[PDB]
């Protein structure tokens, strides 16, 4: 897993600096990942959830660590906080919480040491 400095603007300065491609949406470049995640930018700016930027970036520009090769998804709780605060506004604009980002696909904080998640 070769690490790339994050170049997607809205994912700069979120807690980690390096990502790896392709991401889970099969985007093979950060230009493609950024083109999609920046569609959410209005929701980040209106602050429907303080967790939204980190949650989205943890999927679109997932964390890359120098030696550690295992995946590090966001935690189910982070997703649930973001879905709680932002899915009502999304429905008001005429959309729905994206099916790809259903929180029950995410590991639970501390429930397992075989699948680690990101929260804090």
């Amino acid at each position, epitope marked *: 897993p070769v690490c790339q400095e994050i170049t997607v*603007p*809205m994912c700069r300065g979120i807690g980690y600096n390096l990502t790896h491609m392709p991401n889970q*949406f099969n*985007h093979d470049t950060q*230009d*493609e*990942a*950024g*083109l*999609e*995640v*920046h*569609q*959410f*930018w*209005p929701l980040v700016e209106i602050q429907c959830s303080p967790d939204l930027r980190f949650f989205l970036c943890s999927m679109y520009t997932p964390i890359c660590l120098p030696d550690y090769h295992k995946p590090l998804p966001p935690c189910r709780s982070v997703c649930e906080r973001a879905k709680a605060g932002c899915s009502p506004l*999304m429905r008001q*604009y*005429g*959309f*729905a919480w*994206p*099916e*790809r980002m259903s929180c029950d696909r995410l590991p639970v904080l501390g429930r397992d040491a075989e699948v680690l998640c990101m929260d804090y």
Partner: antibody
Amino acid sequence: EVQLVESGGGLVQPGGSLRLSCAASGFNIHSSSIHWVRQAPGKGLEWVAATYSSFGSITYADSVKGRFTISADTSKNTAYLQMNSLRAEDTAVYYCARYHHPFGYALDYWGQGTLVTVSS
Amino acid sequence: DIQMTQSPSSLSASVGDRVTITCRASQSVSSAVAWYQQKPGKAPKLLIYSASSLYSGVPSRFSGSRSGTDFTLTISSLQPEDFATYYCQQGVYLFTFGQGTKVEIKR
């Protein structure tokens, strides 16, 4: 380099059908948002429809809902506007346009427009 | 259904003149208002987004501002190539347009 090119415009009988194409270069449509905007001769701009890859959504203006359908051929990096049951009031120049990157709230790249004439 | 009412519908002004175009939302809206310039036979070109942010490459004489439900596009010094119709746009993800302002150059 980064651009949009439309094709498919021309004459169609009232109640007929016509498919427009919006061919992209320099970015992948399947990770972007493509909108359609039309302009009747001598009139103003009217927003018609849009897809968002982020939301996985397709939205149609009430004036065309039920008659117009969007699809895409990702291998050709081309979006389509399928028009059915065409009316005289659908006569217009049709534009496709990209949702503004990175900041949103607007349409940054536009195709050159193609004229659809609904006449017998 | 938000309505954007644009005024004036047309205007004439000399090179070097200051030109102001106004678009009024029918109800309280956010600053999600954009301005476009459309020249004959061409697609609209984005000038301003989010009421007052200048788009890439847009000349310094264009600017935007808002007061309440009133959004204004200002050309500080009209140039002959600024002949166009100007449109306001409302919306975050789905858009509605004002009816346009035709700007003609007095010479």
